[PDB]
Amino acid sequence: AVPPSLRLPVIEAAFPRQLHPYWPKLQETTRTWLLEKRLMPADKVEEYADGLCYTDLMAGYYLGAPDEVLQAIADYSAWFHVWDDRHDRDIVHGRAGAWRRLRGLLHTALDSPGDHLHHEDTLVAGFADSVRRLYAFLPATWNARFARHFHTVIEAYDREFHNRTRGIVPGVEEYLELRRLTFAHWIWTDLLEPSSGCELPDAVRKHPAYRRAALLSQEFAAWYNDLCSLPKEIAGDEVHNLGISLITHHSLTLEEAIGEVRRRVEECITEFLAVERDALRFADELADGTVRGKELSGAVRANVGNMRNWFSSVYWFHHESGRYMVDSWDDRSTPPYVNN
Ligand SMILES: NCCC(O)(P(=O)(O)O)P(=O)(O)O
């Protein structure tokens, strides 16, 4: 089971895990994609890819997604972790120019992914393949919203690059704002929509209950990552972690900061339970007797159900994934699955 310091009894009792039926094929298809797109060396794909559990993380989240939608999401999620690793290595090795050029290419490819499917930088070509596929499911209005959100994510990664190269730890509130962008809260929230087959109108997805449920699902996922990834992040000189901000700016000991992060995570769960009632009541209200109302109600219900599924998927991912097993590495500062 889960060690006491990381255990969340409410998740275990009230957020039962779910798994999408396409998971076995999803796992192998993403492994093949990482190999074919040269996002990881063949030996590292064979030794670590399945053990990283990226497809499991998505298959526990976007329940009900069409298989091809889930495949594009899973490829994107694996890509997103490889990009996190590249960013980290560029920082560690002082590759400011390589990072700046990658950042510019990602902004361009995000707006024009088809143009970049055969780019010489394999990380850019793999990004472009996953994004072009994500852009084929819903109207171009959704694509434009995904792009606006991801442009903001890329710039948050750039701010992290500057923080780490200058040895700056953000303040707590600065960190919490930044973390909604580096974790890509609004991208995961956008991806609920192709998974349930419907672009939600602005009036629906901006309803306060939908917005707050979406926010709390992501805050839990990001801050539980902070709690569980703290050991590897301290070992890797990462500065972006709520516990690190608390130690640096509020004078907490390691133990005190861990307890504070845990309490904030636990409160996300019970705040989510309150707002979920309101979001499901809104879903009921959307079912106004019309065909479109039934469609919107069902989509909102499926999306809020997946906001709930994110809690359990993220919880178990952190205990299953090889990504965080720092105690097993020869060099605690260099995870074996990254290209160093
Ligand atoms: N979400 C991507 C990877 C992370 O969660 P990880 O802790 O590096 O796995 P980050 O903290 O960098 O956001």
Ligand SMILES: [Mg+2]
């Ligand atoms: Mg990271």
Ligand SMILES: [Mg+2]
């Ligand atoms: Mg990161």
Ligand SMILES: [Mg+2]
């Ligand atoms: Mg982390």
